[PDB]
Design an enzyme around this catalytic site. Structure first.
Site, PDB file in Angstrom:
ATOM      1  N   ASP A 186      -0.684 -16.267  -7.203  1.00  0.00           N
ATOM      2  CA  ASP A 186       0.597 -15.921  -7.805  1.00  0.00           C
ATOM      3  C   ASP A 186       1.795 -15.926  -6.823  1.00  0.00           C
ATOM      4  O   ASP A 186       2.550 -14.958  -6.755  1.00  0.00           O
ATOM      5  CB  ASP A 186       0.485 -14.605  -8.625  1.00  0.00           C
ATOM      6  N   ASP A 189      -8.399  -8.758 -16.243  1.00  0.00           N
ATOM      7  CA  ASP A 189      -8.961  -8.723 -17.599  1.00  0.00           C
ATOM      8  C   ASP A 189      -8.294  -7.633 -18.447  1.00  0.00           C
ATOM      9  O   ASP A 189      -7.731  -7.938 -19.502  1.00  0.00           O
ATOM     10  CB  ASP A 189     -10.497  -8.552 -17.567  1.00  0.00           C
TER      11      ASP A 189
END
Ligand SMILES: C[C@@]1(O)CCN2C(=O)CCc3cccc1c32
Length: 312
Positions: free
Chosen positions: A152, A179
């Site tokens: 990222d 998640d």
């Protein structure tokens, strides 16, 4: 490339020595000072750790989950105690309290480059030279010492301070945390990652190249600015799905000519080749003409930064 100078070694030692004095991180030991900004998944606050007296940056992620999941998240974040580099934001610890995960880290008084960019308008090439060195070094560190890629890279994940340091943060180390969370921008993602194809550290190099063009021109560079848009800038709307399609289907962005050096232009071009096999790698980037020139430049990043953002 991963060896440290005297100053760097000393600062890294001083951080660890201060960190050792902090015990187990607990919710009630924090006093909120101010809001630093917002990161993907939660808000970041400048806090006081009351017992130690240490000022920290605390990111709070709101998550309604069973003790099973959170305890696994906390254990997976423990890996951050192993990341020790001048180019990686210092980590204090992580804990769960009343529906929220806290990630406590080193306070960077210059904030993120996304915030610095808003203030500055555009960031000078020599300043971007130091930024590029720090990103390559941080990514090399993560790869070589921990077998991990950032995933990222973006201006909001590059932190800066009044001592002139440049460090990466928010690199995914916990699968369970991703998640449960699950929603940050995909606008800096490489064409191969957007096509679900073959992805490595090469995809982080694309994100760095894209972040550099953005900071140089003062605008997210996709779609490219027209002849009239560049005149307003140097003298000399797309929905998220349309943008991601543009990245995959169109030639990569580039810096405007005759405003930046050919070395800087070539450097970003090599980061932005759509084919990850042809795109430059960290080893090649470390010896690029732009990197060697910037490395030898005596640039007062702290001075530039304090003047620009009004720090103090
Ligand atoms: C990603 C991050 O949460 C890291 C911590 N941080 C700072 O220390 C300075 C301000 C800031 C702004 C946006 C995100 C963050 C920070």
């Amino acid at each position: 490339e991963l060896e440290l100078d005297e100053q760097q070694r000393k600062r890294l030692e001083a951080f660890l020595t201060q960190k050792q004095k902090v015990g187990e991180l607990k919710d009630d030991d924090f006093e909120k000072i101010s809001e630093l900004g917002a990161a993907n998944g939660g808000v970041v606050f400048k806090v006081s750790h009351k017992p130690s007296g240490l000022v920290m940056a605390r990111k709070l992620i709101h998550l309604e989950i069973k003790p099973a999941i959170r305890n696994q998240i906390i254990r997976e974040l423990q890996v951050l105690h192993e990341c020790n580099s001048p180019y990686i934001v210092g980590f204090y610890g992580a804990f769960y309290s009343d529906g929220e995960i806290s990630i406590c880290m080193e306070h960077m008084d210059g904030g993120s480059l996304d915030q610095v960019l808003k203030k500055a308008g555009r960031i000078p090439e020599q300043i971007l030279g130091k930024v590029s060195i720090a990103v390559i070094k941080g990514l090399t560190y993560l790869r070589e010492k921990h077998k991990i890629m950032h995933r990222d890279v973006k201006p909001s994940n590059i932190l800066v301070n009044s001592r002139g340091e440049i460090k990466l943060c928010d690199f995914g180390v916990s699968g369970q945390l991703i998640d449960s969370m699950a929603v940050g921008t995909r606008s800096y993602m490489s064409p191969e990652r957007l096509q679900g194809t073959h992805y490595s550290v090469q995809s982080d190099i694309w994100s760095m190249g894209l972040s550099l063009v953005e900071m140089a021109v003062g605008r997210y560079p996709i779609p490219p600015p027209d002849a009239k848009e560049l005149e307003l800038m140097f003298g000399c709307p797309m929905a998220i799905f349309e943008l991601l399609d543009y990245i995959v289907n169109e030639p990569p962005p580039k810096l405007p000519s005759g405003v930046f050096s050919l070395e800087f232009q070539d450097f970003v071009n090599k980061c932005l080749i759509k084919n990850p096999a042809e795109r430059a790698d960290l080893k090649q980037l470390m010896v690029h003409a732009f990197i060697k020139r910037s490395d030898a430049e005596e640039v007062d990043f702290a001075g530039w930064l304090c003047s620009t953002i009004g720090l103090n």
